[PDB]
Amino acid sequence: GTSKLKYVLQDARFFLIKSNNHENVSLAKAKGVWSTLPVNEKKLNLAFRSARSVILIFSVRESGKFQGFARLSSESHHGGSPIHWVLPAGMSAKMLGGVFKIDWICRRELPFTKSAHLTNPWNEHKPVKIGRDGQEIELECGTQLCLLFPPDESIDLYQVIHKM
C-alpha cells in the first residue's frame, strides 16, 4: 500500500541527487549514507532542521533513470571511517567529507520516460529529470514523482515514521 509512504512525504522537502557513477549509489544503498559537495551539504543541513522529512531522489548521470529515493536521518557528520566513494575526475575525498545518514524508502528504478508529465516549478518548469545535483523539487512535483516509483516491498516505513 501507499498510505505510510504518503504520510512520510507529507510536507516533505525534495532534492534531486545527480551521481556521476553507479558505484556510489550502490554503496549508498548498502551503507545508508550519502555525501555531496559543500554547497549542497549546507543546503541539506538547513533543510534537515526545517522539515519533517528531507527526501533525496537519486539519478545516475546518463542512465536515463532514477535509482530510488531516501530520507535524511541526520545532518552531515565528519570523522567517521572514510567511505570508499569512487571519485570522478576533478572530485576529491575532502569535498565529499560530510556524511549524511539516510533511510531508503525505495531502491527500485524509475525511467525518465515515466516522469515526462512532471515539471519542477523551482527549475523553470523543466521536466523534473532535468536539474543539477542538489536542485530542490517543489512539494507537489516531488510527491508525485516519488509516488510513480514501483513499490519496494522490502522496506517497512514504520521506523521512518517514528523518526519524524
Please identify, using beta-carbon distances, which residue of 103 and 133 lies nearer to ligand OYN: 133
Contact indicator for 141, 119 with CB cutoff of 8 Å: yes
Please identify, using beta-carbon distances, which residue of 36 and 143 lies nearer to ligand OYN: 36
Give the three-state DSSP class for 63: coil
34 is in an annotated binding site: yes
In the chain the first and final C-alpha atoms are separated, in Å, by 20
User: What does the per-residue mask of binding to ligand OYN show for 2-31, with x meaning CB under 6 A?
Assistant: ----------------xxxx--x-------
For cell 527500485, what's the residue?
A: 108
Which alpha helices (DSSP H) does the chain contain, by range?
3-9, 22-31, 38-50, 139-148, 158-161
Q: Which of residues 105-134 bind ligand OYN (CB under 6 A)?
A: 133
Q: Which amino acids are annotated as binding site for RNA, given as ranges?
A: 18-20, 34-35, 85, 133
Q: Which amino acids are annotated as binding site, given as ranges?
A: 18-20, 34-35, 85, 133
